[PDB]
Amino acid sequence: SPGIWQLDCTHLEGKVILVAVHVASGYIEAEVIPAETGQETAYFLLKLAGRWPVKTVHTDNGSNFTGATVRAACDWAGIKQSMNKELKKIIGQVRDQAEHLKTAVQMAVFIHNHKRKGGYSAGERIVDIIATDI
Amino acid sequence: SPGIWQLDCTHLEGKVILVAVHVASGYIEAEVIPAETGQETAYFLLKLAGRWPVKTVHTDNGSNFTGATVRAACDWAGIKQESMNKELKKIIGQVRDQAEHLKTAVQMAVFIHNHKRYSAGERIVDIIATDIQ
């Protein structure tokens, strides 16, 4: 399904990164957040859901999903409740180009989503899948 | 034209919001940033450019665009350098009391703006998909 996303967490340098993968295309959205809390997780999901047509988000079902605020954000937005390693590999390639981990993460996202073999990139695949579904 | 974005700033509650509009569709990306500085502006653009095929960003060419950091980020990413602000502030005001923090209310407004019905979110994907084809 075009509307299905997988949310995971990963850890580098003592910081938390949330990674949302559009399962059909491999497109990712990722961000450093200050703590793996419900409130931070709810905000990240609200942000995502405003940018793409997010129907279902499969999560790890851990401590930051048991509370009131993810549930309220997901309700509001109508969301029903390898890659970490790949992304850390790219972050390592660019890390020294940035002062702050957050910048390196976004460079990695860029790389991941625009890389192509000649065929298409993940950014191209997500648009093609959502447009075919519209 | 599919690759063209307009970046503007707007101000509420003494905070700074950056708004990127995909000109052909009206789709928006917006967020609250801590100050209207080069470094914050560069980071917002880097983020955007990783998510959409951004060729050209039209900016207001003000103080946060004259420096080294924005130039470096745009280079790297291959980016060449009032109704909407007012629309977004209107929506923000409708949801404001539903959120503790302005930042949340902004993202609720983004959601509303982009999904209101085609929607803007539907239009941007259609335009980019037709371009890749």
């Binding site: 409130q39 609200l46 509370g67 549930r71 309220a72 | 539903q98 503790e100 949340t104």
Partner: peptide, 6 residues
């Protein structure tokens, strides 16, 4: 119950 603090 706010969207960021329920």
């Amino acid at each position: 119950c706010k969207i960021d603090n329920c």
